[PDB]
Design a binder for this molecule. Sequence first.
Ligand SMILES: *[C@@H]1O[C@H](CO)[C@@H](O)[C@H](O)[C@H]1NC(C)=O
Ligand SMILES: *[C@@H]1O[C@H](CO)[C@@H](O)[C@H](O)[C@H]1NC(C)=O
Ligand SMILES: *[C@@H]1O[C@H](CO)[C@@H](O)[C@H](O)[C@H]1NC(C)=O
Ligand SMILES: *[C@@H]1O[C@H](CO)[C@@H](O)[C@H](O)[C@H]1NC(C)=O
Ligand SMILES: *[C@@H]1O[C@H](CO)[C@@H](O)[C@H](O)[C@H]1NC(C)=O
Ligand SMILES: *[C@@H]1O[C@H](CO)[C@@H](O)[C@H](O)[C@H]1NC(C)=O
Lengths: 49, 96, 145, 184, 232
Amino acid sequence: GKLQDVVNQNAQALNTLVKQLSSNFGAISSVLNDILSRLDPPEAEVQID
Amino acid sequence: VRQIAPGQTGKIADYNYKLPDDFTGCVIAWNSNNLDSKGNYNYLYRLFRKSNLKPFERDISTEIYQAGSTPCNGVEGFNCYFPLQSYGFQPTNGVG
Amino acid sequence: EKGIYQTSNFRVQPTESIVRFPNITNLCPFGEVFNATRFASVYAWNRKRISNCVADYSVLYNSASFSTFKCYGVSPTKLNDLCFTNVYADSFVIRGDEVRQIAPGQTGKIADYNYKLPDDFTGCVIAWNSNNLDSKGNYNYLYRL
Amino acid sequence: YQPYRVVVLSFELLHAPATVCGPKKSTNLVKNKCVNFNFNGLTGTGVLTESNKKFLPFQQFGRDIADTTDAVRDPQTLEILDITPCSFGGVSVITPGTNTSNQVAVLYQDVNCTEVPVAIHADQLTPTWRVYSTGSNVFQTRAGCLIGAEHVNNSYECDIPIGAGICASYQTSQSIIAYTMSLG
Amino acid sequence: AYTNSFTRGVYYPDKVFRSSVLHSTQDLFLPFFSNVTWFHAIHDNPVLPFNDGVYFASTEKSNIIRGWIFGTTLDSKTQSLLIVNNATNVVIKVCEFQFCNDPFLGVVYSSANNCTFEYVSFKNLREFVFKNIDGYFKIYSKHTPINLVRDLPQGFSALEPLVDLPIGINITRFQTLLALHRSYLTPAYYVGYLQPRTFLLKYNENGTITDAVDCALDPLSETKCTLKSFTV
Ligand SMILES: *[C@@H]1O[C@H](CO)[C@@H](O)[C@H](O)[C@H]1NC(C)=O
Ligand SMILES: *[C@@H]1O[C@H](CO)[C@@H](O)[C@H](O)[C@H]1NC(C)=O
Ligand SMILES: *[C@@H]1O[C@H](CO)[C@@H](O)[C@H](O)[C@H]1NC(C)=O
Ligand SMILES: *[C@@H]1O[C@H](CO)[C@@H](O)[C@H](O)[C@H]1NC(C)=O
Ligand SMILES: *[C@@H]1O[C@H](CO)[C@@H](O)[C@H](O)[C@H]1NC(C)=O
Ligand SMILES: *[C@@H]1O[C@H](CO)[C@@H](O)[C@H](O)[C@H]1NC(C)=O
């Protein structure tokens, strides 16, 4: 069980990192092309930031 | 006057005067219905262009616009356009 | 010094830019409206329900029967992007020299009975030129001055 | 005295559900190569491949445990394609140290050595870089594709580690070699 | 005039295929072991509300239920909605119907003008999830056999997305339409309502919702929701 916990802790941390790409953090979308297909880069710049 | 700004659209901003998005300067404007009106038919502007301007580029070319798919030459006929039309300025008109 | 050093990254670049979409298959009744055999006046109106209708605008422009096109809200090149709700069309009859008198804020001949309009109604114009069917008893139309 | 007639097109928008507009015409689909793709609005970059997955006729695309799109249905031929990423990796340079020599070898992590002169843009590079993209010194490790080193059958101690049992060193003209390491 | 559901009434919340995946969703669902009304027409069609969704289920013998009238005011002033099946096809027409006080079908009734658009497509149990969000109108359904006496069963089957509609009206109330032999004009079916919940759906090999857990049913189901697993 001590060897299994190192495998489980490392695999859980990598799943949290990939699922964090579906957050928008306050922007209008989490998809980077949908900001670049409905805004112009004066204030599409402030949503990518 | 709202088209003289960084990153604006409209036929003054797409086809006549394109400010860059990283601009450093000032834009100054004032109403001149004292002198510029009476109409006047030498204050022109462009309506048609095959691709948008880059920042700080002007263009003088009276090429007739390929707006019909079949070509025309020299003479404005069907779907042929002279790109420069004028402003109809008259002091009875409302502001705007 | 001696070692191994991770310096760059590499990446295979794309070659094509393919586009897939459903079959353009919901065609619209464009045939019994302006290729018909009976037209209207300003006295008579038809309010038509143009909906569940996704068909093209190019033959409305790129044909050899419609004369004049000048249009502010859109360029004819991209008819594909903008998609409209509540599409309305009504037919009329107007004499010859009243071409340029329907415009944003227009004060010509026909501004008071052909309903003068600002640019709240954005859209282009389509100008079919009849030369045989209108020629010679067809005085059925109505107008008020 | 012409029966003239023009019709103005309709009023304002962002107003109701299904609309009235033009066609969305399609390009032919191409497989096994890295492409940009648009399937009904879902945009990406990857390699398409016919899949051994079959799903329910109202489902359009597939997702996995971390919500990555990994399958798609073509909206004309109702076929199920796979999506894999285009090839990426690191570029590592093996040097014996500048105060000893100036010859290097390059490892390309997680590629075959036939996919290398398109992974890097070798025709768009300096001619001094095209030495390290093809040739006779080509070795396929589990660490990737090593290029610029001579694969010998001796076994020595590890000097510069590469991975999965393979090391490299500066040995006797002189060259850079690649060997399985000896345990003792 | 009241029974419970057990696990009845879960549907596919999107068009995404998944396999060997437990997935967590936050949509409008019918809560597990809730209170659903019971209307039997044996000797009963009132003007029930449409709050933010309606579950419907109605088992039959000889095809008596026809369809549903939706709308807001029911006065032939606001836009109304309608569905009628004929054993020929389906008709969904969005007119401004002149309404009566018993809109059955005869062994018929249509006062439709100023319309908008139109579309043409015991051993029974027939489920229906209606919904009107963001100006759309969605319908989910499934028909399935039974082996019981009269009650809603305790099996598991998930409902498919039948047809989405571009309606764009405001909707408040609804009413069903079923027929009877004699025409009585005066001048059997369950109803449950949907709430916002959080569910944990289990997808099998070929990709079908096989099990679900209501994450606010009881404290043991909150542990399954936190661990994202069916065994603790
Ligand atoms: C779309 O049209 C093509 C014709 O090339 C046909 O093969 C395909 O089955 C159609 N898809 C439909 C109707 O969904
Ligand atoms: C490299 O070697 C040279 C002589 O071989 C020596 O003068 C120089 O200092 C060395 N470089 C460093 C960084 O020590
Ligand atoms: C390298 O090429 C061989 C061909 O013999 C192929 O079988 C193998 O899958 C390739 N390895 C890769 C692409 O990693
Ligand atoms: C190692 O042995 C293999 C066996 O096939 C041989 O082909 C290869 O050339 C040898 N390499 C060296 C440099 O000894
Ligand atoms: C549901 O039905 C039961 C029947 O035993 C009844 O006692 C109860 O009051 C009803 N309502 C709720 C909220 O449980
Ligand atoms: C899923 O599909 C496979 C092959 O189509 C079949 O063998 C299996 O019985 C199906 N059902 C399951 C896994 O419940």
